[PDB]
Amino acid sequence: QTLRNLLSKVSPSFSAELKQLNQQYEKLFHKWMLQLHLGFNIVLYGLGSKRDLLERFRTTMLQDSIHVVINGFFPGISVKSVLNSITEEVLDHMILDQLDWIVNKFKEDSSLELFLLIHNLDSQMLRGEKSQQIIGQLSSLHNIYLIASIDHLNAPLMWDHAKQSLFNWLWYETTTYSPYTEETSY
Amino acid sequence: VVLCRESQVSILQSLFGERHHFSFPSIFIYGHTASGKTYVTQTLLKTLELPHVFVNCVECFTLRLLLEQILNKLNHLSSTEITCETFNDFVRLFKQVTTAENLKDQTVYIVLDKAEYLRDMEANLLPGFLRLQELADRNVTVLFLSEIVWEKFRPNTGCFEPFVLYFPDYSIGNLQKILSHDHPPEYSADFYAAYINILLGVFYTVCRDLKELRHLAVLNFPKYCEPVVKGEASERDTRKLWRNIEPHLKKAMQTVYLREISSSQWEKLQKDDYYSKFILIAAYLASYNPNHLLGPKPFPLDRLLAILYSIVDSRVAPTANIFSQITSLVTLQLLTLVGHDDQLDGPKYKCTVSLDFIRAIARTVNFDIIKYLYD
Amino acid sequence: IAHSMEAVDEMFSSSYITAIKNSSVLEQSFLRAILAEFRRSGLEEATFQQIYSQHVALCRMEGLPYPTMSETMAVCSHLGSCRLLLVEPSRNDLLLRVRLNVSQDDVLYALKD
Amino acid sequence: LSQVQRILRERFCRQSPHSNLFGVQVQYKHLSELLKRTALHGESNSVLIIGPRGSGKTMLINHALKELVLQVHLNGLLQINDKIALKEITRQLNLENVVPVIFILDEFDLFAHHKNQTLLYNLFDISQSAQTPIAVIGLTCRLDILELLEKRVKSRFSHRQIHLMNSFGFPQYVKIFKEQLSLPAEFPDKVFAEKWNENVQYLSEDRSVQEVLQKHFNISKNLRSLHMLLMLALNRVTASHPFMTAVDLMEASQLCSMDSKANIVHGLSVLEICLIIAMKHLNDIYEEEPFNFQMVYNEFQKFVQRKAHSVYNFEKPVVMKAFEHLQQLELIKPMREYQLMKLLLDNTQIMNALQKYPNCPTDVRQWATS
Amino acid sequence: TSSMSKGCFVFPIEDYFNKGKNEPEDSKLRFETYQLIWQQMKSENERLQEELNKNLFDNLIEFLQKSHSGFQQIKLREIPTAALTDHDLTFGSLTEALQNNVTPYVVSLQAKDCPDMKHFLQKLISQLMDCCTHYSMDSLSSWYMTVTQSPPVVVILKDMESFATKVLQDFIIISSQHLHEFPLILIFGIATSPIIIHRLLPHAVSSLLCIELFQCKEHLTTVLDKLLLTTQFPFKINEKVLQVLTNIFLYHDFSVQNFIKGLQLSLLEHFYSQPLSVLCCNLPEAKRRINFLSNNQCENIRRLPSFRRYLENLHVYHMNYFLVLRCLHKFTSSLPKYPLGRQIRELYCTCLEKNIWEYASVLQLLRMLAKDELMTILEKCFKVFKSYCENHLGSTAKRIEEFLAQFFEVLRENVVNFIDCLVREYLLPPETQPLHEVVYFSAAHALREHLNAAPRIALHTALNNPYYYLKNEALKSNIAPDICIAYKLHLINLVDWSEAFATVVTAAEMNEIIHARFIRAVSELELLGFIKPTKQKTDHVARLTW
DNA sequence: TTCAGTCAGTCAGTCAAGGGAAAATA
DNA sequence: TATTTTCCCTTGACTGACTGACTGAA
Ligand SMILES: Nc1ncnc2c1ncn2[C@@H]1O[C@H](COP(=O)(O)OP(=O)(O)OP(O)(O)=S)[C@@H](O)[C@H]1O
Ligand SMILES: Nc1ncnc2c1ncn2[C@@H]1O[C@H](COP(=O)(O)OP(=O)(O)OP(O)(O)=S)[C@@H](O)[C@H]1O
Ligand SMILES: [Mg+2]
Ligand SMILES: [Mg+2]
């Protein structure tokens, strides 16, 4: 495993051909924010990994805003951890009850704005329907913004008509060929 | 009043004897649903004017409630509040409370009904009630009412066997005489007897329950008087009324007897005279194929998709909407996953729907399920 | 020596055999039916139905009148209450596993006399 | 007369003490002698009386106590916890204000089911060691009372055993029946007492009475059943029927031994009978294997369409309701459709019950036979 | 920075909204107009939902009135029950419907806090005390006698399918025994087929209850009649956008939320892409924006293809077109066969698709109609005319009044001629008139791909034909990224697959890194929902089969 | 066209791991 | 309310007996 991780001297065949698509889809950042501010949320579905695109998006756009990133690909994450991060550190306060408290807090004040970045939403740790219900109730609020990505072939089965009614989903065909070097744990 | 009950009544009255006499400690009565275990004993103990305390086992789901209700009713009959926690304390308080003059040389009776729950309350409670006359030693008799025979109340260790008693099975004559008594004063007794006769001829085959039968008669009476009110038939037209009323009762047998139609709607009526469907059909056809007797079997999503594509002779793109629509049904209980090995990788589903619903659904979109269901 | 022998065989010996000897007639027939069914099968557990059928056959052999199921259930309940068998007859009735609480040789030695 | 009725009601129902004892001479003599030893002297002993239920275990102690100081009676059903037992002991001993004595332990076996058998262990210890004279006697129905106890409590348990079996023959049962239904010499009206004794004498040798006695002797020698029989028979005696007759004993014997399952089946209806016949057929074809509602319904449909008349064309909901009703009386226990049901009856019972069914048609009978 | 052995690392609006240097000020006017329009839309939608819920609660209140009419010797009286994220507010409204009208005592119960009868009764009595020790039904009866010294009690079981069966059975049994002394009424909340009731409550228990059942396309038809069929709202859509929205609504899921969402996405895209969206507003605001327009706006107006072919005239056309279409729908729905269509949706679709003059097929039935049908249709048309004032068609109303007042074949022929002249006279396709593209939007692929995207189709396209987005003539009938090579070679034991992959990658060209590329391809394939290792071979899995 | 011998292709009996909800304990 | 253990029921490969199509008569 370590030997494979060390060896990364390979070079892609079509370099500029892949490079131009990066800017081709980076041109959509302003449209992304235009859609996202008005009561929608954005999902990425494509072959290549979008982590490069997410990194470029956060560098270019997510500077003067309050943003929190979930590395859902980590084999040790659960919704309790993200709730703890939201309440303890993002919020100055010092799981269903916690969800109710957070919903009530953001209902109390409209002056707080958070950008929720989800690198992976379809990982094995977040495929539960109750966890998706929690996340949907979180993102249903008008003061939380959601950028997500899916890679599983059988991903859309996870949520139903009510859950997909919670998420004001908007789709974006972004078919890069980036390798899953970081995501693959081997 | 009690009708067609003179054997067990006289047996019970002989059993009681005199107030200063002693009787059995435990008598176990059993019978069928409407056999009369409740009306007979209540009317008897009201007529005799004896100290009896009536207790329902369903209401007293807790031992404390049972004992405290018994004690409070007994004290109220004798005449602030008595609270006990165990059976021993209840026995002590009973020995303390029965020493009243009016409860000195009389037998005090503890009528229980719906006793089927007593076996599911505690282990030692039933033997405690069985041997009450020994422990209290105060001229105490306890009755048992049930629908299960005594064979199923027996504990492993054995106890004081009550005297077993059976209330009799009813008959056509007894049932009619019970029914033909509470006649409406606005018409003839012969009319009521004939109505009960035709009602029994229609329904006695399956629905022997006197309560259900009388409820059906009460519901069905108003339709029967319409022929004589309108004047098309006379009070002596037995065949005419039979022909007029028979299909109505036959249909009420299908509808009202299962209570699919609420009684209010019944009386009001008589007074007033897409891709989800194909997914479900594919699921059903895949479930019932490799008897309908042994039940359906789970099937994977691959075969469901293949069947769905094969049936539909049109370009159905496997979008995400159809994927979410498939799982939007399992929340309606029309499907059930099994195994829970994975949530996304090959979810096997079992289709828990009846055949008639499938046939109606197919009729909705003009497709035939039968031709694909035999092999 | 007689006093000591009486004390030792009255305070140490098992009383199962003489309890079986003093049992009633129908109880003896039930024991015989169970023993015959076990000889036919060879298992240490049997349902109530096979034992009941064997008991009906043995009653017909003995000339005894036809016994009802409730009477047999009462006899079995009495036998269980003294732990001569092992059974859970409270809820299931016709499908009760019945096990000998003592060795078969002791039962035969009690029933031979 | 009222007086004799009251006397017999007190004799049988309450099981009050009586002077006549039956086949317990040695056992009662030993028990009363030991009680006298423990009373007149400071020695302490422990005894268990083991017997089948209804064999008059209580009588031995209740009479030997009269043969003879504070007595404590403990029943396993009233006091279920050690705290309750302690409360009762303190209250009965009249030492509740402060905080030889005889201990009587009814339902002794249940005391072996406690968490630590603390009460039994302490009683055994104080009996074996404490200088205060304490006598403990327990009542037992299980024949394995020696194996429900812990090793140490068994070590301190003195192995004093009394066995109450019904070791008496049929002629002795005849003598017992003759004596038990006899008025004493303390009755006010003496000529009627002598005539009553003459009548019971005559009833003793009546062979139809001997039929009842032989039948209930084969059923159960336990005297509780015989007392119940005598009470039920005596219930049919008034002024208009001044003396008991053999026909009364026959009636009581028949009323004491009627089967409940046949009666319940007699209480059923037509559809239940048809479903039971179909159930018997399915059980016959599928030897000792379960089934469900669909196979039974298909069998019933086959019978009604082919062999039976065109009448009785019932739908699925009514048959489902009938199946629910049969499941309600616990005649059918699961191991709602497609559920592995089973039957709780025997074939010959169904046949006999149908034999007594009043209005059974002929085609249904033929289907049952076929 | 974002990579470590832990899974949670934390690091104006119009400025985001507008990125082009074309016009910022017109952009910020467009955004405000769009926001106002959408606020009006949401307000009217909320009004519609409130009206519908009040309509339902009226029927429920009347049911409860008729039920308690019975409570006003028992003679077999039963327990009155009524079967009925957003649900949380729904029943909440019901509370205000019931507390202000029927009783002052209404409680709600949650299946989460009713595991046994004890907790159920404790919570019930606690709620009863708030609405003002081993409690029982006798405690409830004594409390009711103490407080009332007639009004019944209403209990809301908002998730009946989640309760315990034993608790329900025991509660119903104990409650039925005290109707004479303690009134009880139940409202069940059901979001599934009601047949489930018969699978929880046995018929023996169920015999104690008198059940009533109380409650999609009609909603969408009504909202679309009050959204697009009304002339007041300025913006509209073309044929294909409406067709896609309908063909997803009545095919994929009967949900109106995504329809409204598509409406607002279309509005946002139309107001974003087109600068001349500034042009269209309410007529006074429209004209005042017309008066002051930049030179580039006049350039855009000058280049409109519909203008190259060539507002108030278009608006009066719409206000007469919609009334004439309403009359046509009244005509069509009168027929028993319903040839043209069932609902107003199909009428508008077939009127907008093309000049209608099956049209003669419907006229064939029209030729053979009875007199009473004509009378009823004429009365309906007259009431439609009276419904709307400020009519430009008063003379036609007078003519049809003369037609009706005269009340064989010739008269029916004349009125048929009148209606046919009407439908020829007014209805037309909208794009025939110029300057339509200002108000209209049509980029069907954008909306269609955005709202109902296909992941599997896109994945297959990427893994089979890379040339579809890599324009280098990589495929016209091997030379492809190894991802595609492996995926195509799949359609498979690992040793043979690896040997074939190595020989293919060498044909396309110490080489140990080919093994590394093979491992990477296998791992990335495993991450996707494609493969799972098996034991029959080194690995043999074919989950796709497509 | 159905009933006797052959064989090849078929089919059910049989020996193991492991998931998991009931059971037990604090 | 949280945590740890147990055998019953599901999946699956190994193994040995079985029987449908073929041929020939009557
Ligand atoms: N033997 C009877 N004689 C007269 N009326 C009877 C008789 N049995 C039942 N009834 C009537 O039927 C009603 C209902 O029957 P019940 O007396 O309740 O039967 P039950 O044996 O008590 O069964 P349960 O426990 O009530 S379901 C009574 O209130 C009477 O009006
Ligand atoms: N040896 C005996 N002498 C006289 N009467 C006896 C004798 N054995 C039994 N009986 C009678 O048996 C009747 C019933 O005995 P019970 O006292 O009910 O049984 P028990 O001793 O209480 O046993 P349990 O297990 O505690 S219920 C009494 O009324 C006695 O008259
Ligand atoms: Mg009753
Ligand atoms: Mg006793």
Residue numbers in the entry:
A (entry chain B): 270 to 363, 369 to 460
B (entry chain E): 7 to 85, 92 to 285, 304 to 320, 349 to 433
C (entry chain A): 748 to 860
D (entry chain D): 17 to 84, 94 to 124, 153 to 388, 397 to 431
E (entry chain C): 3 to 13, 25 to 85, 94 to 105, 112 to 159, 177 to 193, 212 to 277, 281 to 375, 402 to 448, ...
From the publication, what sentences describe this entry?
Eukaryotic DNA replication begins with the loading of the MCM replicative DNA helicase as a head-to-head double hexamer at origins of DNA replication. Our current understanding of how the double hexamer is assembled by the origin recognition complex (ORC), CDC6 and CDT1 comes mostly from budding yeast. Here we characterize human double hexamer (hDH) loading using biochemical reconstitution and cryo-electron microscopy with purified proteins. Although both yeast and humans use the ORC, CDC6 and CDT1 to load an MCM double hexamer around double stranded DNA, our work shows that there are clear differences in how the two organisms accomplish this feat.
The engagement of the N terminus of ORC6 with ORC4 is seen in the human complex only, and not in yMO. Also consolidated by other human-specific interactions, this ORC6–ORC4 contact collapses the structure in a folded configuration in which recruitment of a second hSH is sterically impeded. To mark the structural differences with yMO, we refer to the human MCM–ORC complex as hMO*. The hMO* structure could however transition from the collapsed state described here to a more open configuration similar to yMO, although we did not observe such a structure. The ORC1 IDR is critical for ORC6-dependent loading but is not required for hMO* formation, and could have a role in this hMO* rearrangement, creating the space for ORC-mediated recruitment of a second hSH.
